[PDB]
């Protein structure tokens, strides 16, 4: 279903003035809208997007009247996002000398939503606000806005160039704004934003505020109009006397390309001009033509290849039942290693949804398996056209729900005997103690973990799994460029891609001296390519 | 690469091979027949690239280049085809050995020096890099050439010289109502107690057809891990596990069995003439515009980093989620060819990351035309079995990390607890259903069925061998070890009238 998301973006000259050495809030906001809108148009999102702009010299809003709702220009109504949206983001977004109360723009864009949320189906109605919190304003409608939001079901977010609270990086790991360089106008705006969100959402109101930098390298940008992957409605079976329905889900699922490169002509730019055929012709006798069924299949057999059609195999091959998830037995959790984790997906499976008895049964599973340190062997079959597989099932407890994770297990044919040697047997390559201490000093200076103080948990200085694939970012960059600049070469790789790709270089500065220790203590020759 | 395996098969042609203490048990000839058929099938499944031969002695009719009388060779060192299987199954069976006696000799004097000479010549004939020299005799008496002392002496001299040349002979214990004793003519002429009245020489496993396949010491890929930008480590990346499947359809003509050339061709719809590579543009029509592009920059977007590894840092293993698992884990072994001295470094870093339990997170690019992903490196130590043979290689188990867009969303689930009695109920259930894990006991029954079908049709059997579906529980012992636990847990959790479905 569609979503009626709108944008109430500050265009005032306050953010258009960049602080020397710090990226302008105007330009960071432009970066965020560009990245969101390219991820929206290229994915061809059906959710309707509109836009109003405050801090603008012009005023063409339906709520005019003077000193309120003024200096605010509504540009795009709720229709689909396109490349003309990119053009307007790049061209029409200009430093707006005029300033206005952002609350009036909020009410303008709410009226815009009400104008265009009708006549179209919608599973979500939304507004956000780009603001450096330094634009001229008067806090008058803020609580009126909170009430109007509660009465119109419209969600919000306020972005700042300022961080919420590592090398200084934009789109990477580290700071992206001075920690105390925010003006008192920005501080009072932050207090207003905080109170608005704690009145609207709740304790996650501080979990409601974010910034441009982490936007420029993460994909939460698409979390609440998001629709989860297709579930697996099936029934796990216990031997021959028990069976419970399931709603399986694939938590880890590597993202694929949505569109392949269609082979169009170079003379008319058409797939229609590109017609192809496969010619089965005997590899000898001047390529004697063979009918597409006169070619049949064989299989390799020892020192020969026996002709063996697929029909003879399928007419008796043991085929899977279909959507069936049959348990086989149980093994200890210590008997399974990550090397036996087969497949690319992670089946974050769940019991029968909306069946609280299934929830009780699943909780019993989680508790007893955790206490027994015990894993389950279940035969899995996606459907009848999918061959059966063996897999390991182990409990996975989240802070809000217990769950079971199913990962495919290997067969005997999967295993390969690849012999190696004993590294510790290498007395000629025994690690000298000084080298070991240099390695330890490096690792300590190279460690990417910080023990979170006043807690008991540990952090990672380079959390990567929470970051999307960097190739899609530059891929869409070049896609939009080539679309807009077919005559111009593809753009280079954005710096933020390196920043998100590179780890915190402060750890590297720590490791510098131990790096010298290692390179002095270890003889490492090189082979030329 | 390493050499191949030479498997030499040689059976006696006499009455001892054709007789038993109980003729219901298949005679030594026919028993050797199912042994050779089974090892041929196993080699076809697993290692159908080496060379296998069949030769006879004792037969009064001989056929060999040296013209050694009573030494008749049947098949040269050859890969076992269906032809060999069918031409050995005709003599398979107690009726088949009578056909053998009729069309083939059985029972005559012979010298072991003769068979050693002919097998040495046959091994001299091969033209391949070689590693294994395995000769497998088939006889049920040690004496017959110890009877002639000169024959025994020359035979043992020849065998000793051959084993000096690496020619490795393995004794096969064979059933004999008089016995097949060792340390009488044996343990002094074989390179490596009971009178071996039985025929136990691992013949059980020789009859155990193996549905396995693995390459011969094949290198997957060797990479060079750059530390920061200049210090580089040569590493060998390998797997102890790799997906296997039925061989792909080998296309062949239905009227000649000849693989028909399958050439595809894109051609102009305007003309019908072939499309040049220039004539084709890559297109992805986003919105209303068709973005036109080409292959070179397409792969230059697919590729982002050089073949190698770019280290990110060190972190305790606790910083990873158990559900976080991108692609199946690999193993990393030190390599001392491109960078020498990295074995000392590998041992040092292995021990040090063992001490602090710090994993080596790394930006990894296997080759060109592939994005640099992020991988977790955990020290995978050497594990020695009972005989101190490394069952887990020393090195690093490399574990792969997904991305934010590479994780689908999960709808919120209720965490509704279960009473401790239910927990104990399933604890008893699982304790009844408890056993150990071993991956060699698990297979794909569909794949096994494929293998058996292909064999039996190539074997021209009236019926395919039936794959055992080990991916299905035994319901009898299942309900035996559940009993009242199932319905007790039901009434504890589920209403009796409300099944989990409907």
């Amino acid at each position: 279903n569609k979503a009626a998301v709108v944008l109430c973006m500050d265009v005032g000259f306050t953010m258009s003035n960049s602080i020397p050495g710090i990226e302008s809030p105007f330009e960071q906001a432009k970066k965020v809208i560009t990245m969101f809108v390219q991820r929206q148009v290229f994915a061809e999102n059906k959710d309707e997007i509109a836009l109003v702009l405050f801090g603008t010299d012009g005023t063409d809003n339906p709520l005019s009247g003077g000193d309120q709702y003024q200096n605010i220009t509504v540009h795009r109504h709720l229709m689909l996002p396109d490349f003309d949206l990119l053009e307007d983001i790049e061209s029409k977004i200009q430093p707006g000398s005029q300033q206005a109360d952002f609350l009036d723009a909020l009410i303008v864009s709410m009226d815009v939503i009400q104008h265009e949320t009708i006549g179209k189906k919608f599973e979500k109605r939304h507004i956000e606000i780009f603001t450096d919190l330094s634009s001229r304003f008067s806090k008058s409608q803020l609580d009126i806005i909170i009430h109007s939001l509660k009465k119109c079901d419209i969600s919000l977010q306020f972005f700042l160039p300022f961080s919420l609270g590592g090398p200084f990086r934009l789109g990477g790991h580290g700071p992206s704004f001075p920690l105390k360089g925010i003006t008192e106008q920005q501080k009072e705006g932050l207090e207003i934003v905080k109170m608005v969100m704690i009145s609207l959402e709740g304790e996650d109101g501080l979990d409601e505020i974010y910034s441009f930098s982490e936007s420029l390298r993460k994909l939460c940008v698409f979390k609440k109009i998001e629709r989860h992957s297709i579930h697996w409605p099936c029934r796990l079976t216990i031997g021959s006397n028990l069976s419970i329905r399931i709603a399986a889900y694939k938590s880890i699922l590597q993202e694929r390309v949505k569109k392949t490169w269609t082979v169009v002509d170079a003379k008319t730019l058409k797939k229609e001009d590109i017609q192809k055929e496969t010619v089965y012709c005997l590899n000898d006798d001047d390529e004697t033509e063979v009918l597409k069924e006169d070619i049949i299949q064989g299989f390799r057999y020892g020192s020969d290849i026996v002709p063996f059609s697929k029909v003879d195999e399928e007419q008796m091959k043991y085929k899977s039942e279909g959507k069936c998830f049959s348990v086989l037995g149980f093994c200890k959790s210590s008997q399974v290693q990550r090397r036996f984790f087969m497949g690319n997906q992670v089946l974050k499976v769940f019991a029968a949804r909306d069946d609280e008895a299934a929830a009780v049964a699943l909780s019993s599973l989680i508790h007893a398996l955790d206490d027994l340190d015990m894993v389950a062997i279940v035969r899995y079959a996606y459907d009848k056209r999918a061959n059966p597989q063996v897999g390991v099932a182990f409990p996975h407890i989240k802070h809000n729900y217990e769950c079971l994770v199913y990962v495919q297990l290997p067969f005997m044919e999967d295993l390969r005997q690849y012999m190696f040697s004993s590294l510790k047997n290498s007395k000629k390559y025994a690690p000298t103690e000084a080298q070991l201490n240099a390695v330890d000093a490096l690792i300590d200076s190279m460690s990417l973990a910080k023990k979170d103080e006043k807690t008991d948990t540990l952090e990672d200085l380079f959390p990567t799994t929470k970051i999307p694939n960097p190739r899609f970012q530059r891929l869409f960059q070049c896609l939009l460029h080539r679309a807009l600049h077919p005559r111009e070469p593809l753009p280079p790789i954005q710096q933020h891609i390196w920043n998100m790709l590179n780890p915190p270089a402060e750890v590297t500065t720590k490791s510098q001296i131990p790096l010298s220790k290692i390179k002095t203590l270890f003889p490492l020759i090189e082979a030329k390519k | 690469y390493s050499g191949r395996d030479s498997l030499i098969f040689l059976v006696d042609a006499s009455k001892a091979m054709f007789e038993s203490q109980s003729e219901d048990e298949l005679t030594p000839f026919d028993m050797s027949i199912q042994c050779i058929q089974s090892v041929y099938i196993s080699k076809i499944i697993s290692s159908d690239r080496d060379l296998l031969a069949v030769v006879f002695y004792g037969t009064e009719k001989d056929k060999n280049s040296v013209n050694f009388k009573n030494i008749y060779v049947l098949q040269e060192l050859d890969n076992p085809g269906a032809k060999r299987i069918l031409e050995l199954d005709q003599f398979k069976g107690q009726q088949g050995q009578k056909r053998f006696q009729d069309m083939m000799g059985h029972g005559s004097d012979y010298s072991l020096s003769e068979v050693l000479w002919v097998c040495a010549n046959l091994f001299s004939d091969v033209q391949f890099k070689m590693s294994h020299k395995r000769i497998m005799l088939f006889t049920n008496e040690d004496n017959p050439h110890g009877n002639d002392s000169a024959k025994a002496s020359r035979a043992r001299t020849k065998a000793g010289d051959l084993r000096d040349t690496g020619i490795f002979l393995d004794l096969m214990h064979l059933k004999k109502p008089g016995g097949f004793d060792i340390s009488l003519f044996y343990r002094d002429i074989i390179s490596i107690l009971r009178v071996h009245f039985e025929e136990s020489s691992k013949l059980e496993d020789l009859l155990r057809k193996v549905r396995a396949k693995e390459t011969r010491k094949r290198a997957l890929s060797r990479l060079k891990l750059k530390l920061n930008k200049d210090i580089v480590i040569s590493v060998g990346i390998y797997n102890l596990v790799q997906k296997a499947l039925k061989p792909p359809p080998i296309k062949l003509y239905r009227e000649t069995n000849e693989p028909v050339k399958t050439k595809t061709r894109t051609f102009n719809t305007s003309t019908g003439g072939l499309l040049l590579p220039s004539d084709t543009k890559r297109s992805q029509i986003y919105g209303s515009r068709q973005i036109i592009l080409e292959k070179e920059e397409t792969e230059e977007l697919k590729r982002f980093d050089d073949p190698g590894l770019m280290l990110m840092g060190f972190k305790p293993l606790v910083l990873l989620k158990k559900h976080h698992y991108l692609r199946p884990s690999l193993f990393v072994y030190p390599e001392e060819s491109l960078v020498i001295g990295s074995s000392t470094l590998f041992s040092a870093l292995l021990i040090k990351c063992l001490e602090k339990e710090v994993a080596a997170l790394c930006r990894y690019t296997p080759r060109r035309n592939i994005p640099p992903y992020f991988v977790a490196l955990v020290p995978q130590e050497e594990e020695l079995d009972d005989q101190k043979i490394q069952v887990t290689p020393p090195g690093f188990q490399l574990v792969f990390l997904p991305f934010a867009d590479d994780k689908r969303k999960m709808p919120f689930t209720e965490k509704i607890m279960a009473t401790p009695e239910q927990v104990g109920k399933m604890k008893a259930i699982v304790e009844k259903l408890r056993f150990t894990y071993r991956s060699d006991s698990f297979e794909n029954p569909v794949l096994q069925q494929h293998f058996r079908n292909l064999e039996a049709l190539a074997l021209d059997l009236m019926e395919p061998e039936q794959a055992v579906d080990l991916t299905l529980p035994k319901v009898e012992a299942m309900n035996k070890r559940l009993g009242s636990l199932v319905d007790e847990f039901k009434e504890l959790v589920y209403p009796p009238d409300y099944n989990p479905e409907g």
Partner: peptide, 23 residues
């Protein structure tokens, strides 16, 4: 060879498949 199948020495010795066996 110990730890190596006599059919294909240099390849790990194969034990028969057992499947599932509740205890």
């Amino acid at each position: 060879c110990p730890g190596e199948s006599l059919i294909n020495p240099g390849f790990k010795s194969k034990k028969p498949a057992g499947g599932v066996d509740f205890d």
